[PDB]
Amino acid sequence: TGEVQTLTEKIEEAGMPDHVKETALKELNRYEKIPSSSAESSVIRNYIDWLVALPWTDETDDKLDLKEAGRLLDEEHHGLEKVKERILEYLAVQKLTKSLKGPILCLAGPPGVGKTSLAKSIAKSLGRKFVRISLGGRIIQGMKKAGKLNPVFLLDEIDKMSAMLEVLDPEQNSSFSDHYIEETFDLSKVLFIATANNLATIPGPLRDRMEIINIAGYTEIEKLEIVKDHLLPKQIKEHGLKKSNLQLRDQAILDIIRYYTREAGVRSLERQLAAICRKAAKAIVAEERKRITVTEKNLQDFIGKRIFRYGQAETEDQVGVVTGLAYTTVGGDTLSIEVSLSPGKGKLILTGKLGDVMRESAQAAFSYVRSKTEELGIEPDFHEKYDIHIHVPEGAVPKDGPAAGITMATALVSALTGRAVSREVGMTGEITLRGRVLPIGGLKEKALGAHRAGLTTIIAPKDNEKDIEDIPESVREGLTFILASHLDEVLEHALV
Amino acid sequence: TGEVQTLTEKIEEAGMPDHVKETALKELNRYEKIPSSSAESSVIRNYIDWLVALPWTDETDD
Ligand SMILES: Nc1ncnc2c1ncn2[C@@H]1O[C@H](COP(=O)(O)OP(=O)(O)O)[C@@H](O)[C@H]1O
């Protein structure tokens, strides 16, 4: 007998068609079964097995029925309306181009918005097997974990990297190589997808090889529903217990959000849910009570005391201190710029991000007040006998640096004129020497996160109005958008 | 038999004319097929293949 058949037999199997390989196959095969398992006989010994799984024949046969899919996406993700409309485009388009084409997409946005899930779900629809392949530091493995050559790889994180192009280049991806196994391989039918946050670290080379989709974040409204129709049941079922075991009243869910999560995704949200799913169960086993109802009063008896503040029931107006809406890699955020007055020379030194991008803007809001002075109420003998300190907290992403113009401006004035920025207002906008207010980036996410921390008024660029259209109903409804074109406009509304 | 021919054969092939190279060719070739695929026998093992494709006479009638 001998194991000279156990392998060989399944080798000539229907699996393993291509002969370009079978050469190298029986080659290292008819090798040295002579002699026993020497230190040598253990080597190539294994080389054969990795080689046995690498799919060839098999390959999911695919179903592409939009009427479903599009509304299977609506079974496992709440909102993302616009993001789906673009997953289907990537299919209705697929169906025609019978062979998947180079442009493979990256999903981008704050973590916890569903990037990973959308993928799994893209694949559920295509009935291809799905594989996560983390790139925090090798497709080699990939296929194996799916012994079916028509998969969906999800290059999870391409941006926590320290060049691989070869693997995706439409021209080359067809013929695929890999050391320690050197032999071409066909990846024709392989739906590739990428996750990502800070679109920077991604290599320019790659970002062009790939088509991008942005998942955005979520309105209180949205989250809430995500909690009710997906998040909760999922955690219930996962902490093994019944829907009849624990229910949380809407208002409490809202509370969990406003007060224990200031994220744009829903990861923190999920975690606090579980907190309860957990607390819940220990009851169900001991007390045995078949039901547990967490309410807006109970909440503390589950997830602790409040964690973030929401609104102005606490804060109270300040001087030379404005709250600018900035575009963090992780959503809208509320970084506050400050300005301080110490005797000296016209020089101005700023802190925080070293910012060479900032100085330009700073010494412009500066170079504005330089002009229109008495007109603003401030001793013209100032740039001559004061020294101004500015602090611009890190977070805003590169493109959006100059979007803090009207902010530093507003502060520098509020600081010089002993006035006071209205704690309620959040602002964003680029400044010019003359005092012009130029267009800004991502007003959507900005006001989204402006609402999250619960501000009232949100001063922004006039030439940005056609951007308010796409701001989700719920938030555009709790905000009074003051639009402006020159400082004085901003100053009049943000100071008191 | 042994794979002592699978490669060698296609080496003396019409492909691989220039002799300035063939030296370094059969050189690292008549190397150490002795012994088995040791941690060593995997090294130069491949060095030969990259060398097999590199063109030497395939001119495209312009
Ligand atoms: N819109 C959404 N619908 C359903 N689940 C969501 C949604 N957004 C986030 N989640 C949570 O995350 C999982 C899928 O999203 P997730 O992968 O966490 O976002 P990320 O991809 O950044 O982690 C779900 O199991 C759920 O816990």
Side-chain angles (χ1 to χ4, degrees):
Chain A
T1 307
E3 290 193 17
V4 297
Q5 56 169 303
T6 302
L7 308 174
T8 62
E9 284 292 350
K10 283 183 74 291
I11 302 184
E12 182 256 332
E13 160 206 338
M16 300 136 255
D18 236 45
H19 305 64
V20 185
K21 63 152 191 303
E22 206 172 24
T23 304
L25 291 189
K26 186 184 178 181
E27 273 180 350
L28 288 184
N29 181 332
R30 254 192 176 194
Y31 199 94
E32 285 181 1
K33 184 46 62 181
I34 323 179
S36 300
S37 181
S38 176
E40 323 284 345
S41 178
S42 304
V43 187
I44 299 294
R45 173 176 165 176
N46 207 326
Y47 189 114
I48 183 178
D49 278 54
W50 275 19
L51 230 161
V52 189
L54 304 188
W56 314 100
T57 320
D58 269 303
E59 156 207 281
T60 283
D61 300 278
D62 286 317
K63 283 277 298 176
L64 322 173
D65 185 328
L66 314 197
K67 211 104 296 181
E68 191 104 89
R71 270 44 222 176
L72 178 169
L73 301 201
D74 282 35
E75 183 185 294
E76 291 176 333
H77 298 93
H78 179 262
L80 299 204
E81 325 91 80
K82 209 164 172 54
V83 176
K84 289 156 188 172
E85 185 71 341
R86 254 248 56 179
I87 309 281
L88 304 180
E89 284 180 27
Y90 183 85
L91 295 160
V93 147
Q94 163 134 341
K95 200 166 185 178
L96 311 176
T97 305
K98 288 284 192 176
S99 286
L100 196 169
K101 65 175 189 169
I104 41 89
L105 17 44
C106 171
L107 291 161
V113 284
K115 296 161 291 177
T116 313
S117 169
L118 272 188
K120 270 170 182 172
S121 194
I122 258 80
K124 204 161 192 172
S125 172
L126 281 59
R128 303 160 124 91
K129 292 307 177 200
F130 175 93
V131 186
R132 174 203 189 88
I133 140 206
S134 176
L135 300 195
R138 168 171 205 168
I139 309 307
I140 322 179
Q141 301 176 8
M143 253 59 41
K144 186 269 186 179
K145 291 174 62 180
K148 307 233 176 181
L149 64 76
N150 169 25
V152 178
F153 270 51
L154 173 71
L155 303 323
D156 198 327
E157 302 167 313
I158 33 184
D159 43 333
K160 297 191 188 297
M161 273 186 299
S162 200
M164 86 166 63
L165 298 295
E166 175 172 6
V167 59
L168 312 131
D169 189 305
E171 294 183 358
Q172 184 174 180
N173 47 14
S174 48
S175 178
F176 192 93
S177 65
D178 175 81
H179 320 277
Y180 319 145
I181 219 301
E182 285 201 15
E183 196 151 54
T184 180
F185 197 102
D186 195 24
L187 302 189
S188 305
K189 298 80 178 295
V190 195
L191 204 302
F192 279 65
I193 308 187
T195 303
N197 325 73
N198 183 10
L199 270 162
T201 149
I202 274 184
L206 283 301
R207 180 197 312 122
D208 303 313
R209 295 267 62 267
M210 73 175 57
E211 176 186 74
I212 286 190
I213 321 179
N214 313 77
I215 341 276
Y218 297 113
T219 350
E220 268 184 32
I221 281 320
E222 268 176 320
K223 276 154 145 189
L224 165 63
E225 292 286 306
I226 321 200
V227 170
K228 282 161 83 195
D229 295 345
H230 312 48
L231 270 190
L232 189 8
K234 180 174 179 289
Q235 289 298 336
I236 303 264
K237 196 257 210 174
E238 200 154 330
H239 288 78
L241 71 181
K242 297 280 66 270
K243 177 51 64 76
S244 44
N245 254 157
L246 157 73
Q247 212 175 350
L248 22 159
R249 297 261 210 82
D250 288 15
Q251 183 61 33
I253 297 216
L254 261 284
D255 279 17
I256 295 184
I257 297 183
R258 275 125 160 269
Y259 298 90
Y260 306 56
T261 87
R262 203 167 298 346
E263 71 204 320
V266 290
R267 196 154 48 66
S268 202
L269 223 197
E270 210 194 359
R271 263 177 162 85
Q272 288 279 339
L273 277 171
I276 320 182
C277 269
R278 237 142 42 223
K279 230 284 179 304
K282 197 261 210 158
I284 322 297
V285 188
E287 293 106 86
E288 283 176 350
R289 36 205 300 187
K290 196 191 175 185
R291 162 239 40 88
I292 276 192
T293 285
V294 29
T295 192
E296 41 180 330
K297 304 315 166 189
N298 282 135
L299 202 52
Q300 318 174 21
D301 302 345
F302 286 92
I303 52 177
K305 19 85 283 300
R306 301 282 228 256
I307 277 184
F308 309 104
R309 300 167 165 179
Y310 180 51
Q312 334 310 350
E314 300 157 273
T315 71
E316 249 79 37
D317 311 83
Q318 231 112 10
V319 209
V321 170
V322 197
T323 321
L325 303 324
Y327 186 103
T328 300
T329 86
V330 314
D333 206 3
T334 17
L335 320 178
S336 317
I337 301 183
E338 307 178 64
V339 204
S340 185
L341 289 176
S342 168
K345 229 180 182 66
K347 184 77 177 185
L348 83 172
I349 185 180
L350 26 58
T351 82
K353 62 165 56 178
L354 316 184
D356 212 38
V357 176
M358 281 293 169
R359 193 173 258 99
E360 180 157 322
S361 233
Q363 191 195 11
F366 183 87
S367 305
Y368 172 84
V369 188
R370 257 292 183 93
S371 63
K372 293 75 179 295
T373 294
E374 57 170 15
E375 192 175 1
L376 190 54
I378 164 61
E379 32 179 354
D381 195 31
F382 98 78
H383 70 81
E384 210 174 359
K385 289 289 185 176
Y386 269 162
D387 237 342
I388 83 182
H389 292 278
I390 305 183
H391 179 36
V392 218
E394 315 198 22
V397 110
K399 141 216 164 204
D400 194 45
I406 71 169
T407 317
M408 17 174 32
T410 299
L412 196 250
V413 156
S414 168
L416 268 176
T417 85
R419 278 210 231 170
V421 154
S422 173
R423 65 195 198 262
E424 288 189 341
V425 196
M427 70 167 59
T428 202
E430 191 171 342
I431 235 44
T432 89
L433 271 182
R434 300 278 302 184
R436 272 139 57 59
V437 174
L438 297 185
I440 239 47
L443 216 211
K444 181 179 180 180
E445 298 84 338
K446 256 165 189 173
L448 200 52
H451 177 242
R452 231 140 44 194
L455 285 58
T456 305
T457 340
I458 172 255
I459 300 178
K462 181 68 185 182
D463 307 18
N464 253 125
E465 177 172 323
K466 188 62 75 174
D467 253 11
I468 299 173
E469 197 79 304
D470 203 31
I471 287 187
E473 346 67 34
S474 343
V475 42
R476 173 181 47 180
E477 192 171 349
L479 290 191
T480 48
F481 289 95
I482 297 315
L483 305 197
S485 19
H486 314 255
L487 283 183
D488 15 283
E489 254 219 284
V490 192
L491 282 170
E492 188 180 319
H493 259 86
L495 285 185
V496 40
Chain B
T1 307
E3 290 192 17
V4 298
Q5 56 169 302
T6 302
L7 307 174
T8 63
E9 284 293 350
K10 283 184 74 290
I11 302 183
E12 182 256 331
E13 159 205 339
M16 300 136 257
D18 236 45
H19 306 63
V20 185
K21 64 151 191 305
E22 208 172 24
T23 305
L25 290 190
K26 187 184 178 182
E27 274 180 350
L28 288 185
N29 181 332
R30 254 193 176 193
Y31 200 94
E32 285 181 1
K33 184 46 63 182
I34 322 178
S36 300
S37 181
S38 176
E40 323 284 346
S41 178
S42 304
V43 187
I44 299 294
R45 173 176 165 175
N46 207 327
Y47 188 114
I48 184 179
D49 279 54
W50 276 19
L51 230 161
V52 189
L54 284 166
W56 313 101
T57 313
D58 252 329
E59 263 183 337
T60 332
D61 298 37
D62 288 317

